[PDB]
Design a protein that fits this description.
The structure is a monomer. The chain is α+β, with helices and mostly antiparallel strands and 245 residues long. The protein folds into 2 domains: 71 residues, Phosphorylase Kinase, domain 1, CATH 3.30.200.20; 167 residues, Transferase(Phosphotransferase) domain 1 (Transferase(Phosphotransferase), domain 1, Orthogonal Bundle). It contains 9 helices and 8 strands. The strands form 2 sheets. It has a 5-stranded antiparallel β-sheet with strand order 1-2-3-5-4, with no helix packed on it. The chain has a 3-stranded antiparallel β-sheet with strand order 6-7-8. Helix 3 packs antiparallel against helix 5. The longest helix has 20 residues. The protein is globular and about 55 Å long. The protein starts with 11 loop residues before the first strand and ends in an 11-residue tail after the last helix. The chain binds ligand SR2. This is Proto-oncogene tyrosine-protein kinase Src. Forms a complex with polyoma virus middle T antigen. Interacts with AFAP-110. Interacts with GJA1 and PXN. It is found in: Cell membrane; Mitochondrion inner membrane; Endosome membrane; Nucleus.
Length: 245
């Protein structure tokens, strides 16, 4: 027995793939004739969480199950960072993107939820470089969580630390040249990725706070949000552009 989020699949006109997908595809489409949407083919969580910086549920169906959402016209952030449009992104654009993800996650945090898979592949980009957390392999995963399954908001904070290296390197894979075993052994031994090229020390220190061994010493998303929003006045007021950041 359905709820009010439910729709008939007859209301959905699928168009383009985006797309597959381990558990299933992602399509661009139309809903009720007027409305451009995205449709994940093969949500309970997505019903209860409503925020500006989180991908917005529109509707759901049932086999074949559809999840219908607000459409993000610029695609996933990984691909945006890797692609044509940025080679020209600089630190102020990338820190503001960071601020927005932090804002969505400060919300997740306030609501006592956990994401579990926070990384640039799971951030979606829309018009005006708006970024939204979507879609609630260990290079992004906090040690206590990759090993003992201890997933909390503080393991999300760690992941956000890694997303920050994706931002500053235009979407390069973390721990370059290291296989998941070598990452896991080295991180346990207290290794952390070094300060990326041109990346200010104050931003890399922030990364290091997110990668504290002890989950409870990692900052909150609320602090992250506030630090990143205020960055260019309070932290780096003498920032000058460089070759890449
Ligand atoms: C980039 C992958 C990608 O996800 N493309 C993509 C573009 C636009 C878009 N808009 C809205 N929603 C999604 N995903 C979605 C649909 C339904 C439920 C959820 Br939760 C999320 C969407 C996806 C390719 N790269 C390899 C990651």
């Amino acid at each position: 027995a359905k709820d009010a989020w439910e729709i008939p699949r007859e209301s959905l006109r699928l168009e383009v793939k985006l797309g597959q997908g381990c558990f299933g595809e992602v399509w661009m489409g139309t809903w009720n004739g007027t409305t451009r949407v995205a449709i994940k083919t093969l949500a309970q969580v997505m019903k209860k969480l409503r925020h500006e910086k989180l991908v917005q549920l529109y509707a759901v169906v049932s086999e074949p199950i559809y999840i219908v959402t607000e459409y993000m016209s610029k695609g996933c952030l990984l691909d945006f960072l890797k692609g044509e449009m940025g080679k020209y992104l600089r630190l102020p654009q990338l820190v503001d993107m960071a601020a927005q993800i932090a804002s969505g996650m400060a919300y997740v945090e306030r609501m006592n939820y956990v994401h579990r898979d926070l990384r640039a592949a799971n951030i979606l980009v829309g018009e005006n470089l708006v970024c939204k957390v979507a879609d609630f392999p260990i290079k992004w995963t906090a040690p206590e969580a990759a090993l003992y399954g201890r997933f909390t908001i503080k393991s999300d904070v760690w992941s956000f630390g890694i997303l920050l290296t994706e931002l500053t390197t235009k979407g390069r894979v973390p721990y370059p040249g290291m296989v998941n075993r070598e990452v896991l052994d080295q991180v346990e031994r207290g290794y952390r990725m070094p300060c990326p090229p041109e990346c200010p020390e104050s931003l890399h220190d922030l990364m290091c706070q997110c990668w504290r061994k002890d989950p409870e010493e990692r900052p909150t998303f609320e602090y992250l949000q506030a630090f990143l929003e205020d960055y260019f006045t309070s932290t780096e007021p003498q920032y000058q552009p460089g070759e890449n950041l």
